[model samples]
Target: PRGSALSDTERAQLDVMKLLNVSLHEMSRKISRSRHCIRVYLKDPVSYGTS
Candidate 1:
């Protein structure tokens, strides 16, 4: 899993979770990513997600 990048679906889910205003901890659990990574996406969807 180290070399694998996140999928578009994953990013889209991240976008949904962010829009739902879920906590970083909870979002981390849901997405299987670290809290820090969740924060990066939460801080900015347009900045983080694909166009």
Candidate 2:
């Protein structure tokens, strides 16, 4: 909710990412999701899973 303007779909995806971060999945599940859902955050060439 704190960034440049995004369409509703984009916003929804971000929300999903936020939720995933808090989920009880193992590293593999998280990596699997991040691989597919990271395109949006890749806009700035940033690393996400580093956290």
User: Top model by TM-score, which number?
Assistant: 1
Model 2, residue 19: displacement in angstroms?
A: 0.1
The C-alpha TM-scores of every prediction are 0.67, 0.33
lDDT per model, in order?
A: 0.72, 0.44
Q: Write out the backbone clash pairs for model 1.
A: none
The 10-residue segment of model 2 with minimum total lDDT is 22-31
Clashing residue pairs in all predictions, respectively, total 0, 0
Candidate 2's C-alpha lDDT? 0.44
Count of backbone collisions within predicted model 1: 0
Local accuracy of candidate 1 as per-residue lDDT tens digits, 11-48:
78888877888877888799788877667666775675
Q: Once model 1 is optimally superposed onto the true structure by TM-score, how far is the C-alpha of residue 36 displaced, in angstroms?
A: 1.3
